[PDB]
Amino acid sequence: PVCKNCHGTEFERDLSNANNDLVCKACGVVSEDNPIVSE
């Protein structure tokens, strides 16, 4: 929800290269890597 460097509140799930990371558009620090899908 909140970044560690810019403390933004909006995150954008990027699926452009099949990584599905979670990152903000302010600075570009990923919030969670390696997603855990509900199989």
Binding site: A18, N20, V37, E39
Partner: protein, 99 residues
């Protein structure tokens, strides 16, 4: 995750695991089967050795004798399935150096 529609990642099986060890190569076998696949950082107690969480042992509640190591995640969950039925895999450790 298995499946091209499930965003893939391919299976380095058991037929292809034996082909690697026939070369004698003993460092990418460790890299292809826990680093790029299944790495996980377990901190296990030394005496009455079985794993605990962030800084505890929670069976000898002293939180003193702990070694940070790293093993595959699929052996963290074997050591809890095998522990859920009454089998206790006690771990016994040495240090790498001073043969």
């Amino acid at each position: 995750t298995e499946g091209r529609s499930r965003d893939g990642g391919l299976r380095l099986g058991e037929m292809e695991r034996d082909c690697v060890i026939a070369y004698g190569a003993s460092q990418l076998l460790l890299e292809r089967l826990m680093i790029s696949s299944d790495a996980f950082e377990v901190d296990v107690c030394d005496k009455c050795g079985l794993m605990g969480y962030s800084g505890w042992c929670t069976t000898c509640k002293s939180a003193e004798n702990i070694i940070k190591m790293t093993i595959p995640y699929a052996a963290k969950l074997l050591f809890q399935e095998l522990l859920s039925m009454n089998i206790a895999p006690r771990l016994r450790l040495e240090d790498i150096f001073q043969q």
